[PDB]
Design an enzyme around this catalytic site. Structure first.
Site, PDB file in Angstrom:
ATOM      1  N   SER A  85       4.765   0.427  -5.616  1.00 32.55           N
ATOM      2  CA  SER A  85       4.179  -0.910  -5.591  1.00 32.55           C
ATOM      3  C   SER A  85       2.726  -0.877  -5.134  1.00 32.55           C
ATOM      4  O   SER A  85       2.365  -0.135  -4.214  1.00 32.55           O
ATOM      5  CB  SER A  85       4.996  -1.805  -4.652  1.00 32.55           C
ATOM      6  OG  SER A  85       5.192  -1.166  -3.405  1.00 32.55           O
ATOM      7  N   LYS A 122      -5.560   4.203  -3.522  1.00 33.74           N
ATOM      8  CA  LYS A 122      -5.385   5.134  -4.636  1.00 33.74           C
ATOM      9  C   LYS A 122      -6.391   6.287  -4.577  1.00 33.74           C
ATOM     10  O   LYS A 122      -6.030   7.446  -4.824  1.00 33.74           O
ATOM     11  CB  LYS A 122      -5.495   4.388  -5.971  1.00 33.74           C
ATOM     12  CG  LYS A 122      -4.229   3.575  -6.320  1.00 33.74           C
ATOM     13  CD  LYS A 122      -4.387   2.731  -7.585  1.00 33.74           C
ATOM     14  CE  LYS A 122      -3.071   1.968  -7.889  1.00 33.74           C
ATOM     15  NZ  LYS A 122      -3.085   1.410  -9.260  1.00 33.74           N
TER      16      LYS A 122
END
Ligand SMILES: NC(=O)C1=CN([C@@H]2O[C@H](COP(=O)(O)OP(=O)(O)OC[C@H]3O[C@@H](n4cnc5c(N)ncnc54)[C@H](OP(=O)(O)O)[C@@H]3O)[C@@H](O)[C@H]2O)C=CC1
Ligand SMILES: NC(=O)C1=CN([C@@H]2O[C@H](COP(=O)(O)OP(=O)(O)OC[C@H]3O[C@@H](n4cnc5c(N)ncnc54)[C@H](OP(=O)(O)O)[C@@H]3O)[C@@H](O)[C@H]2O)C=CC1
Ligand SMILES: COc1cc([C@@H]2OC[C@@H]3[C@H]2CO[C@H]3c2ccc(O)c(OC)c2)ccc1O
Ligand SMILES: COc1cc([C@@H]2OC[C@@H]3[C@H]2CO[C@H]3c2ccc(O)c(OC)c2)ccc1O
Lengths: 285, 285
Positions: A85, A122
């Site tokens: 997620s 990320k």
């Protein structure tokens, strides 16, 4: 059978994770799904996980809080794909386990959206992958059709509006609308492709590079009804999600750079007959 | 085709409801699914709903706060089946009022599918159904296998425990364990069965009437591992969830009255090869 690539999918009951599981199976990989301890009574998650067994996947129980359990899971496969997620940073524990295990041919972290390097947890995950010397593929560059096409890119809904539709700016900024199933299939094809090792792979199927007005016009053609359009300026546009929508529909972050054929999924994998948006929208008629 | 029963499923993206949708299609019924307004962005709910269209179901948009939209919906079908979460139940009173005004409905199966409430919200729905003279079928009498068999009836988990198991009392009270898919198939077969008009149908497949200890011993035979057992006395056991387990496993409320062949699903529909629990449990091995 012994020459199948072995793939562990992490986040296998997620929106993209579940499609990666099925895509890996359809591609003939020996497919393993990480089974995390239950956090509650969650029948839909449990039944989804065990439905993969009927399709031929294996479940591996492990916990991100138990480093040994992660090491043992990744020792049983050649490739790891995560789709968490975005829990992006939990992947750092996964990287550490992969580094110790030593056997992993490639790691695909939870990307599947905007390229963060052109804009983050990320990038923090990317830096740890590369610092550890883990070979990688980053799959980026597309809007999920379910989240941006099915709703004609209106926020707060997933189905086409009945008569009114907001147009961002003049709706002439090119966006990349891709069926989630195709993202998963491109991922299953690319994870052991020698051509994409240590590369970023852009999912930009040529006929699905559409402006929002072009997408609205696909829908108006399918229904035969013109929708009432209200344009929203960048200033008036400036809640969950605004400033993803801004980057996509005002800045055009998905299309403001060219991508070579050697790094674009639909050219790398031309046998994948990706869903065009006129077909994608037909389910809503 | 013009001879198909037309069925409206209310609650069609729920655990039981989704199975009833598919069982109605597999039975050949012309199947409609209530599409309520989105309350949020819910990718899984939306995609489940529209996936039914590819199987031939149709969606009817209506809202429980809009009486006339409910009247409009039920006028399009012959039979209504509701499977709302176990407030949620009382929403069906709106549905009853709409069915009463519409006048065309041949049968209403309200959201039952568990303990017999005649022995409270389910009973209040029953009274309103019967006061309005709406013909009915009440499908009752089984534990969902996913909630009570796959966990060996332990609370807080949906999968078999690895070493220890709590036994309720001496674990010699008969329980009814039934695969949710069988409950849904029995429901699809009974909803236009002339034999079950205004009746209670008990889902009590004979070979799935088992004590908890018998269920545990089925698992131990499949695994070849004896589980460590702790007996919990009635007094120590002694909240809604706790009350459910108490009635089932201590009072034996699913099995304390015998049922005739003319009111028991497995005898009414002997062609349904229901999943026995030794087969059900194999997916967990
Ligand atoms: N338009 C686009 O391009 C889109 C891009 N994305 C991106 O796709 C990727 C996946 O997102 P999405 O598919 O929506 O993910 P989900 O919301 O479906 O979650 C995926 C998995 O995350 C795991 N997870 C969540 N929290 C934890 C945790 N604390 N610890 C361990 N595991 C956890 C769970 O795995 P498990 O199943 O094991 O329980 C969950 O199933 C993301 O990077 C997202 O940014 C997503 C939406 C749109
Ligand atoms: N062991 C057993 O015998 C079991 C018995 N049951 C019983 O089965 C029946 C269904 O339970 P279950 O499958 O678990 O139900 P779910 O919790 O899965 O939800 C069913 C549907 O309820 C609708 N719903 C919930 N709230 C509202 C609301 N305010 N307004 C309108 N619709 C609402 C929604 O339908 P929508 O799809 O339109 O969004 C939801 O999808 C119940 O009667 C329950 O008591 C359930 C568990 C175990
Ligand atoms: C396309 O790249 C991404 C997309 C998102 C997807 O936009 C954030 C999200 C998401 C999809 O769900 C989008 C969203 C946020 C708020 C909303 O109201 C919404 O309505 C559809 C959709 C997440 C990270 C990304 O890198
Ligand atoms: C007849 O069986 C019924 C079952 C329930 C199902 O027991 C109440 C619920 C439920 C399933 O989820 C059960 C439950 C409650 C708490 C838990 O911890 C649990 O763990 C598996 C399971 C609901 C109504 C019923 O009439």
């Amino acid at each position: 059978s012994g020459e199948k690539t072995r793939v562990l999918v992490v986040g296998g009951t997620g929106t993209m994770g579940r499609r990666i599981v099925r895509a890996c199976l359809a591609e003939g990989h020996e497919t393993y799904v990480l089974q995390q301890p239950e956090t509650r009574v969650d029948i839909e998650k449990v039944q989804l996980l065990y439905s993969y067994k009927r399709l031929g996947a294996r479940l591996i129980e492990a916990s991100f809080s138990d480093h040994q359990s992660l090491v043992s899971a990744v020792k049983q496969v050649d490739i790891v794909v995560a789709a968490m997620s975005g829990s992006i940073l939990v992947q750092l524990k996964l990287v550490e386990a992969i580094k110790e295990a030593g056997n992993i041919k490639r790691f695909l972290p939870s990307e599947f959206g905007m390229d963060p390097s052109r804009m983050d947890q990320k990038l923090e995950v990317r830096n740890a992958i590369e610092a550890a010397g883990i070979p990688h593929t980053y799959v980026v560059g597309a809007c999920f059709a379910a989240y941006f096409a099915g709703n004609l890119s209106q926020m707060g809904t997933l189905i086409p509006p009945k008569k009114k539709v907001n147009i961002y700016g003049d709706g002439n900024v090119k966006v990349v609308y891709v069926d989630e199933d195709d993202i998963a299939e491109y991922t299953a094809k690319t994870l052991d492709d020698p051509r994409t090792i240590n590369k970023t792979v852009y999912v930009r199927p040529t006929e699905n590079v559409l402006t929002q007005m072009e997408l609205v016009q696909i829908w108006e053609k399918l229904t035969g009804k013109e929708l009432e359009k209200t344009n929203i300026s960048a200033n008036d546009f400036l809640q969950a999600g605004l400033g993803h929508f801004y980057h996509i529909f005002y800045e055009g972050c998905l299309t403001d750079h060219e991508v070579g054929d050697d790094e674009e999924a639909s050219k790398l994998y031309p046998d994948v007959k990706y869903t065009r948006m006129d077909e994608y929208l037909k389910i809503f008629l």
